[PDB]
Write a new protein. Structure first.
Lengths: 429, 429, 54
DNA sequence: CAGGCCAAA
DNA sequence: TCGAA
DNA sequence: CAGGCCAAA
DNA sequence: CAGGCCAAA
DNA sequence: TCGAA
C-alpha cells in the first residue's frame, strides 16, 4: 500500500546564533578596611569590610552582545539563551616602585604579589556579602573611606557605555571611545564587601560574632607565577532565559466556546508558587500559588519588561521561576555563580609600631583578559497557512507582575536570603 | 602557580554517640475475652477483645538512654537520632502446675505452650487496635474484666521509674530499685486490644461485621522449642528525629534589609502540608499548606517541646513531617513498627459442658531479654569567628504549633486512621 | 618569636567558648609549619646624601 | 509478608 | 540526602 | 511520528 | 570544593 | 526536557 501522504508535521525552522567578545579589565588592589554604614530605612546599621576582588558581570546580556546585535535579536521572537561561557586569563600584575610619599616609602625591587579568586561567595547563606563601589582617600588611593552613590544599574550602564561608546549625535561622543573597537582596557570599580551587624546601637540582647572567615572560601595564587595563565573557566547552561517573547498563538476564544474549560492537573503542580521567607524569625515561611501574573504575548499581552529591555543590563539573563508556560512543565529556582577576581593589596615596606595590619599600601593593578561566548536559539512555528507565524497554545508564556503593574524579576545585587536569589519589582528606566 | 590559600570551607565538627541497654521483661498470658467499653465524649460504644501480647516500647527515648545520658545529650545542639535497633530473645516460658482452685484443676505435667509475635498490627488500616491495660478478676488472674485508668503517659512513666529508680532524696526510693543496676525483670502490663463497633445502641442502619480475623496477621511459635532463641530483630533508620534544637543562626535582619525578600519556589513544594481526613465520610479530605508553625531556635524561638522533654517518654522519637527546615527539602510522613510479644493463655484441663472456648486458664509468664541500641549524631558549625557556635540560615527549624501555643507532635497510642499516624497537641507535664 | 605555645594561636574565641563546654578536654598534639616568601629590602633609605642605592 | 495502603510491587 | 535502596 | 505540548526527548 | 543549603551526596 | 547527568 503506497502512501501518498504522511504525517510530516509542522514546518518549524530553528535558528542558532552565537556572540563572542573579548574584554580587558584593570582592577585595583584595595586594602581590607572596615567601614561604618549608617542605618537607613529598612537597612540596619552595619560594619562593612571591603575586599579587593572586582566582580565580572558575566550574568548580563550587554556583556555578550553589542547594541546592534541586541536590536536585531529583538526581531526573532522565541529567542532563548541556551548557554554562556567565560574564560578569564591573567597577565603581568603591576606594583608601584614607590608611592607618592617619599619620607617613609622604602622603594623595593622585590615584591610579594597575590591574586584572589572567588566563585561561590554570593550563594553562601551566611556570608551575606554584596557588590559595592568605594570612594578612596587622597593620601592612600588603595584605602577605601566610604561608598559611592552609584547604584548597580548606574555602574552597569557606565560599563556598557565604556564598552560600546556613545551615539554619533551625542555631544559626549569624544569622551569614551568604544572599547570593543579599540581593544583598550576598562577600569573595574565594583568590589566585594563583607557585612556584619553593628551592635553599638543595639538594645537588649546582642550578637557579637564579628565577621565570618571569608578567606576560607577564596583561592589565592602567587601572581608572579601566574603570568599568562588561565585563572577562571566557567560554563553555564541556562534553565530558562527568554530574551524575546514567543510568537502569539491563535486564540481559541474566537473559535470555540471551550476556551475557559477546566481540566484536572492531578497531584502534579502545574502552577509555579512564590515563597516568602522572614530571616528575622517573626513569621514562618509561606508558599503561595496563583501568584499575580499575566501573559507576555497574545491578545492581552503586557510586554513592559521586554519593551524596557530590562534584560539587557538591568536584569540578569537567567530568569528561572519568573516566567511560566502553560505547557505541562516543571520549574525550579535558578541563579548564576558570581566571579570575583583581584590582586591583594601590597603592604608598604615601612615599619609599624604595634602589632596590626599594614597602615599603608603600594598601588597595584591586575590585568585580566576576559573571553565570553553566548549561544542562543530561536523558533518559527508556521502553524497556520496565512497571516504570518503563530505558535501553539501550550507555548503561551506568563510573567509575574506586581499589583501596581511593574513586572517582577531576579536581581543579583542584593545579598542572598537562605542561599537564594530575591524577586523584586523592576524599575522603569 | 603555588596556592597559598585554598577553599578549605568551614570547621564543622561532628560527634557520634551510641547507647546500649539490656532489659528483662515478664509478660502474663492473658485470655482472649470480649469486654464492653462504654461511650464517652467522641468515643462511641465499642466491644473490646483483649490479647495477651505485651507491647515493647522501642519507639521512645527512655528505652535507650538513662536520665544522665539524656541530661548530657541536652548539651549538644543539633542532636539527631540516626538509627535504632532492638533484638528480643526468649527464655523458658513458665506455666503453673495447678491453679488456686483445687476441686476441679487436674494438674498436669504435659503442657501446650505457644508464643505470639506481631510486628505490623498498628499500621494495618482496618484492624484499628490499640494498647490498653486491664484490671484482672480475683478468681481468674488471666481473665481481664475491664480497663485500668492509667494512660499511656502514666504507664510509660511508671516503666521508666521501674527501669531507672527514684532520686536519692525521694521518700519512695526504697520501693523500686533501679532495674538498670540490678538486672532484675520488669512486669509488662500494657497489652494489645482489638476493637469493633457496638451495634446494640445503634439507630438505623447497622454494621454487623464483628471482629476482623487478626490471627491471620500474627506469627505463633511453639514455646517449648523456642528456649533461648532470637524471636525479634528490628532495625529502624530515622528519617528525621531532632532531639535537641539546632544552633541558632546569625539573623540576617541585623545585617541586611533583604531578610524579608521573596524568591520563587517553582513547582516544588518547599512548605510542608497538613492533611485532615474524616473516616465518617461526612467531609472530603483536605490538604492545607502554610500550617501554623514557628521556629524552635533563634530570636523568636519557642522551645516548649524540648524544655518539656516531651520526646523523652511522652512523644516518640520519630517525628517526620512535624519538623520543617528552611532548606530546600522533601518531607514525607514517617511512623515506626509496633512490636508485640506474648504467650497465649493455656486452657485448664477441666472439661466444658458446651462447645465454646476455655472457661478457665492456667497462669503463665514469658521471659524476654531485650537488647536495644540507639545511635545519634551531633554537629558544631563554628560559622563565625567570635561568640560561640552559630549555624547556617538554611538549617533553621520550625515546628508545628497549635493556635493556643501547644506544640503538635506524633503519638502512637491512638489507633491509626487510613494506616497513618495522627498529629495531636502535646500536654504540659 | 612565633607564639606557638599559646591556645589563641590555634583556636578562635568561638571555638574556645565552645571548648569550655566539654569537661575533660586535653590537648593531645600541636603542629606548626613556617614557610618563607620573598624577603623585601629597601632600594634606598630616607637619607640621600650618603645612601648609595644598590 | 514491621516504615505513611495493599488487593500495588 | 526527612530510610534506602 | 495516537496517552495530559512539541518546536522537548 | 561556582547552579536555588551543606554539616547532604 | 526550566542544567544535566
Amino acid at each position: 500500500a503506497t502512501a501518498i501522504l504522511r504525517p510530516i508535521g509542522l514546518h518549524v525552522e530553528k535558528f542558532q546564533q552565537t556572540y563572542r567578545k573579548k574584554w580587558r579589565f584593570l582592577t585595583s588592589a584595595n586594602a581590607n578596611v572596615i567601614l561604618a554604614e549608617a542605618a537607613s530605612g529598612e537597612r540596619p546599621a552595619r560594619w562593612a569590610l571591603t575586599t579587593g576582588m572586582a566582580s565580572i558581570p558575566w550574568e548580563y546580556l550587554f556583556f555578550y552582545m553589542s547594541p546592534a546585535e541586541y536590536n536585531r535579536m529583538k526581531n526573532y521572537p522565541g529567542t532563548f539563551a541556551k548557554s554562556a561561557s567565560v574564560r578569564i586569563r591573567t597577565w603581568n600584575t603591576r606594583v608601584a616602585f614607590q608611592t607618592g610619599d617619599t619620607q617613609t616609602a622604602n622603594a623595593t625591587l622585590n615584591q610579594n604579589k597575590f591574586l584572589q579568586v572567588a566563585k561561590g561567595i554570593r550563594s553562601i547563606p551566611f556570608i551575606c556579602s554584596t557588590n559595592r563601589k568605594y570612594t578612596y582617600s587622597d593620601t592612600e588611593p588603595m584605602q577605601p573611606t566610604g561608598f559611592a552613590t552609584l547604584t548597580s544599574y548606574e555602574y552597569r550602564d557606565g560599563l556598557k557605555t565604556a564598552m560600546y561608546g556613545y551615539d554619533n549625535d551625542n555631544k559626549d561622543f569624544a569622551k569614551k571611545p568604544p572599547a570593543d573597537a579599540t581593544g583598550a582596557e576598562i577600569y573595574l570599580q565594583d568590589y566585594l564587601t563583607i557585612y556584619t551587624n553593628d551592635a553599638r546601637a543595639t538594645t537588649g540582647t546582642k550578637i557579637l560574632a564579628g565577621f565570618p572567615p571569608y578567606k576560607n572560601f577564596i583561592e589565592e595564587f602567587d601572581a608572579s607565577a601566574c603570568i599568562n595563565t588561565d585563572v577562571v573557566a566557567m560554563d553555564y547552561d541556562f534553565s530558562y532565559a527568554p530574551l524575546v517573547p514567543q510568537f502569539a498563538p491563535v486564540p481559541n476564544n474566537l473559535i470555540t466556546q471551550n476556551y475557559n474549560g477546566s481540566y484536572p492537573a492531578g497531584t502534579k503542580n502545574e502552577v509555579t508558587a512564590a515563597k516568602t521567607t522572614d530571616s528575622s524569625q517573626a513569621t514562618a515561611p509561606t508558599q503561595v500559588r496563583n501568584a499575580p501574573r499575566k501573559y507576555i504575548q497574545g491578545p492581552h499581552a503586557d510586554t513592559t519588561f521586554f519593551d524596557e529591555e530590562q534584560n539587557y543590563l538591568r536584569v540578569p539573563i537567567e530568569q528561572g521561576g519568573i516566567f511560566e508556560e502553560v505547557n505541562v512543565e516543571t520549574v525550579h529556582d535558578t541563579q548564576m555563580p558570581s566571579i570575583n577576581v583581584g590582586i591583594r593589596a601590597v603592604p608598604k615596606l615601612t615599619t609599624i609600631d604595634e602589632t596590626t595590619q599594614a597602615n599603608s599600601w603600594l598601588d597595584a593593578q591586575g590585568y585580566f583578559e576576559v573571553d565570553c561566548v553566548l549561544t542562543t536559539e530561536s523558533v518559527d512555528p508556521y502553524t497556520y497557512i496565512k497571516g504570518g507565524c503563530y505558535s501553539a497554545n501550550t507555548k503561551s508564556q506568563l510573567q509575574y507582575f506586581a499589583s501596581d503593574g511593574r513586572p517582577i524579576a531576579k536581581v543579583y545585587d542584593n545579598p542572598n536570603v537562605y542561599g537564594r536569589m530575591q524577586m523584586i519589582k523592576t524599575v522603569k528606566p
